[PDB]
Structure 1
Amino acid sequence: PDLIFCRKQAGVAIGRLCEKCDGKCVICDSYVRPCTLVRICDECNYGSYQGRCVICGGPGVSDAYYCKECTIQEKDRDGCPKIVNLGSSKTDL
């Protein structure tokens, strides 16, 4: 898998989720207790990328959250959690 996190300084944009992966934690893939709202960086929310899914990239229909365990361990305090595809290009998958 050629997938990393963005991990840039996140700003005031809010992450979205498509309807497949809707109630998951963007970090640990859990469904128990969504706690903290996800912020993304300004580059990952731009132009045609505005409003896409943080996890997969599809059309977003709800807000993305950190679960309670990640909030307790302070995993919301790293960079932008958008998934980046290194094996392909920008307008690719």
Structure 2
Amino acid sequence: IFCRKQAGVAIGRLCEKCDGKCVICDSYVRPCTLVRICDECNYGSYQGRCVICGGPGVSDAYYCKECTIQEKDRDGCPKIV
């Protein structure tokens, strides 16, 4: 399930369990570009969380270079709410 309400300028973050993988491609490598999320899945208790685990925002969700070659990173906040 996806948020997909369109993108913004607020970076996303990763818990430490979820540390390292891309958001969709589920890679572990060659991350190129930073993730951005929507205000609605940006506010409040959802500030600085794990887009996947829900855990605390510590490490930065990133985008596997394949995902940027196919521009699957131009859709917005992909938060599994």
Measured in 2, the distance between the counterparts of 1:74 and 1:11 equals 16
Deviations 1:41-61 (A, max 9, x none): 001111111001111211111
Number of the residue aligned with 2:36: 39
Instruction: Please tell me whether the aligned partners of residues 8 and 36 of structure 2 are also in contact (alpha carbons under 8 angstroms).
Output: yes
Measured in 2, the distance between the counterparts of 1:70 and 1:62 equals 19
Instruction: Please tell me whether the aligned partners of residues 11 and 37 of structure 2 are also in contact (alpha carbons under 8 angstroms).
Output: yes
Aligned alpha-carbon RMSD (Å): 0.8
Measured in 2, the distance between the counterparts of 1:80 and 1:28 equals 15
Larger Rg: 1
How many Å apart are 1:7 and its aligned residue? 0.6
Measured in 1, the distance between the counterparts of 2:43 and 2:79 equals 13
Instruction: Please tell me whether the aligned partners of residues 56 and 83 of structure 1 are also in contact (alpha carbons under 8 angstroms).
Output: no
Measured in 1, the distance between the counterparts of 2:75 and 2:8 equals 12
Please state which structure has a larger fraction of its residues in strand.
1
Aligned match for 1:49, one of 46, 50, 66 = 46
Structure 2 length normalisation: TM-score? Answer: 0.94
Structure 1 length normalisation: TM-score? Answer: 0.83
Instruction: Please tell me whether the aligned partners of residues 17 and 53 of structure 2 are also in contact (alpha carbons under 8 angstroms).
Output: no
Paired residue total? 81
How many Å apart are 1:10 and its aligned residue? 1.2
How many Å apart are 1:79 and its aligned residue? 2.3
Measured in 2, the distance between the counterparts of 1:13 and 1:6 equals 15
How many Å apart are 1:76 and its aligned residue? 0.5
